[PDB]
Structures are given as structure tokens and as C-alpha cells.
Amino acid sequence: PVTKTRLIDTPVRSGQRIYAPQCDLIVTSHVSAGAELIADGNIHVYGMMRGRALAGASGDRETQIFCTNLMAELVSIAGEYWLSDQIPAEFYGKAARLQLVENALTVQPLN
Amino acid sequence: TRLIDTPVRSGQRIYAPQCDLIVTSHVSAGAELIADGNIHVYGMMRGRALAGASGDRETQIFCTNLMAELVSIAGEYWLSDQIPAEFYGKAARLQLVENALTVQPLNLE
């Protein structure tokens, strides 16, 4: 337990919940469907992201979500959230980078 | 306390500041319902309902045909898949027990 970033190089399986209190969260493996990722900082997912990522849970709007395989059910920064359908189909299964610009979700490729 | 007898098509946002929300028609996929009180949906509920938006933990959600994408009370949330299949597409009562989501049948046999 530290403010150090929470690194996890083991997949997060369906039904599990990972909470990084006041630090970034890093998942170097695959995130399953029922898997829920939440952190007050940033969220990095370096595998199949099939679950849920809630970044800036405490209200940090300058935080972002970085994925290599964006297949998420729900992706949230601060309070503003997107469901799988709101995610542009252009990115399903590719590398993506979600951040808040005005007061809304934005997605880029991070190439 | 708030009345909506017109379908809520995909993309709409419905606000209920400090009052219950009642939608007597259909809620579409992208439709987002939010309220600080209770939310009743008496039709095809296939969208999102966020109840107790201000933190009211005594609030509940009442549906007659529960097929929602996302349902949350006081921040605690469920997606369509987390809804027990027993109630998907049926009448359901979402409540907070202790500090977790619970679902019962609306009818109280």
C-alpha cells in the first residue's frame, strides 16, 4: 500500500475488481468481461481490454486511459463514460487512447 | 414526480434534479435516465437509468420490462450482463442492500 503506481502483470478475470486508490493502474495482461478496473489516476491496459476501466475516479479530469486492444464494456474518465456502443467501431480491437477535452470522451490511436 | 409519456429514443438525456422520474413509454439503447430520487420505467427498458445520482442510498429502480444497458443507484452500478437472467426482460425492483445492488420481483408474491 503506497501512492506508487499499482502494477499488475497478471490478467484480471471476470468478476474481479482492481482499485488503485490515488495512483495509476497498469495491467500488463488481459482484462476479461466482468473485470472492473478503477483508479483515481491513469489506466494502462497492455492486453485484451474486454472489461471496464474507470479512470480519474476521484475527479481528476486530466487523466487518461491507454489500451492496446480496446474491446471494453465501459470506459470512464472522471464521471463521463462511454459504453461499448459509443466506442467508435473504428477502434474495436486496436490501440486507443481516451481522454477528456472539453467535458466529453475523446479517443485517439496513440501511434 | 416527473412524467414522460413519450418514447425516449437513443441519444436523449433525461434529468430529474430532486424528484422521482416516471417514464410510461419505451427507453431506447442510447437513452440515459438520471435522477436523485427513484426511477420507474413502465415499458421497454433497454437503455440507462442512473438513480440516486446525488448519493441517496434509500432510492430504488422499478421496471416492468428490465433490459437495461446500465442501472446504478448511488453510484453502485450494473451492466446488462450483471443483471441476473431471472429478471432480464421482466418486472424487477432494484434496491441497495448494505452497500450492494439487489434485485427482487416487483410483484411481492
Residue numbers in the entry:
A (entry chain A): 16 to 126
B (entry chain B): 20 to 128
Task: Quote the study on this structure.
In this work, we determined the crystal structure of the dimeric C-terminal domain of MinC from E. coli (EcMinCCTD). The crystal structure of EcMinCCTD was solved at 3.0 Å resolution using the molecular replacement method. EcMinCCTD forms a dimer within the asymmetric unit via domain swapping. EcMinCCTD forms a dimer between the two β-sheets in each subunit, as observed in the TmMinCCTD structure. The tight dimer formed through the MinCCTD beta helical domain is similar to that of TmMinCCTD (left). The two MinCCTD structures superimposed with a root-mean-square deviation (RMSD) of 1.4 Å for the 110 Cα atoms (residues 122–231). Compared to AaMinCCTD, EcMinCCTD and TmMinCCTD both lack a helix3 at its C-terminus. SDS-PAGE analysis of the harvested crystals showed that these crystals resulted from a degradation fragment of the MinC protein at a molecular weight of ~13 kD. Furthermore, western blotting results demonstrated that this fragment of MinC had the C-terminal 6 × His tag (data not shown), which suggested that our crystals were from EcMinC’s C-terminal domain (MinCCTD). This is likely caused by degradation of the flexible linker between the N- and C-terminal domains of MinC, which is easily susceptible to non-specific proteolysis. As a result, we went back to the initial method of using full-length MinC to obtain MinCCTD crystals. It is inferred that MinCNTD, although cleaved off over time, initially helps to promote the correct folding and solubility of MinCCTD. In this EcMinCD model structure, the RSGQ motif of MinC and MinD’s helix 7 make up an interaction interface as expected.
